[PDB]
């Protein structure tokens, strides 16, 4: 099952999630098919808190990839902000 | 349109098969002098039409025997 999920790299107490499309069986911070944006929970409010290449996301979703709850929340929040 | 190699037949004593040597120039990795290298391939030759020394055109295909994975597309020049 292809899934879109967050690969947390960040640093200790300072997470920086990377939205990646990957086979759900591979480890979290491991093999990924394609990266489609980033999310930084800590935000200076003048930086880009979340960047999403919605087009590629839609491409993979149409192909059949599922979406983690948090990635769906991010997509919905950015489309709502727009 | 089709990937292809060209070589000469060094031995044909096998039934329906031939071994062709593909020679190429490669710059030596360290010293630089362009040195000749040879690759010998067991090739499928229906009708055994290839004589030793002939220059033949070969293409890759599915595994046909334990070693044969190439088929003769055409003969280029024969019986030099």
């Amino acid at each position: 099952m292809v899934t879109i999920r967050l690969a947390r790299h960040g640093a200790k107490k300072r997470p920086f999630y990377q939205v990646v499309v990957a086979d759900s069986r591979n480890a979290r911070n491991g093999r990924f098919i394609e990266r489609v944006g980033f999310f930084n929970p800590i935000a200076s409010e003048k930086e880009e808190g979340t960047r999403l290449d919605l087009d590629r996301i839609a491409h993979w979703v149409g192909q059949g990839a599922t979406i983690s709850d948090r990635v769906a929340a991010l997509i919905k929040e950015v489309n709502k902000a727009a | 349109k089709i990937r292809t190699l060209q070589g000469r037949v060094v031995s044909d004593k096998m039934e329906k098969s031939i071994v062709v040597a593909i020679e190429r120039f490669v710059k030596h990795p360290i010293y630089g002098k362009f040195i000749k290298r040879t690759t010998k391939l067991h090739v499928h030759d229906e009708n055994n039409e290839c004589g030793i020394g002939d220059v033949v055109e070969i293409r890759e295909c599915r595994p046909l025997s334990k070693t044969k994975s190439w088929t003769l597309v055409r003969v280029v020049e024969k019986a030099v």
Partner: protein
């Protein structure tokens, strides 16, 4: 035996300059003619001529400036044993541009500057400074 006639030409130039000869003569060839042409056009020699039909002799009239040879160092780079080819962005320059490198490209023999300005690479025949 004789196996690099371009090396023979370069060495004739070098030894004639060392011996303060006014001119040098060698068996001719189209490649030798083109190399002499590029040398003349870059001003390292006075002039050149070819004489004869069946066994052409090419003659180069050398040049001196202050009782000094204008050509300081002439060395073959791509010797027959080890050919040296370079791409357009890898073409060497001699003496930081003061000298000239002779390049054989798909569009004939020319200097490194000309080859770079024409966007081509080729075989580095020799260096002259």
């Amino acid at each position: 035996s004789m196996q690099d006639p371009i090396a023979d030409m370069l060495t004739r130039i070098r030894n004639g300059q060392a011996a303060n000869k006014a001119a040098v003569t060698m068996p001719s060839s189209k490649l030798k003619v083109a190399i002499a042409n590029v040398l003349k056009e870059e001003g390292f020699i006075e002039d050149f001529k070819v004489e004869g039909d069946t066994k052409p002799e090419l003659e180069l009239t050398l040049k001196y400036f202050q009782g000094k040879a204008v050509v300081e160092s002439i060395q073959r780079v791509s010797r027959p044993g080890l050919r040296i080819y370079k791409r357009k962005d890898e073409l060497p320059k001699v003496m930081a541009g003061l000298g000239i490198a002779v390049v054989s490209t798909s569009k004939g023999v020319m200097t490194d500057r000309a080859a770079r300005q024409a966007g081509l690479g080729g075989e580095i025949i020799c260096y002259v400074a």
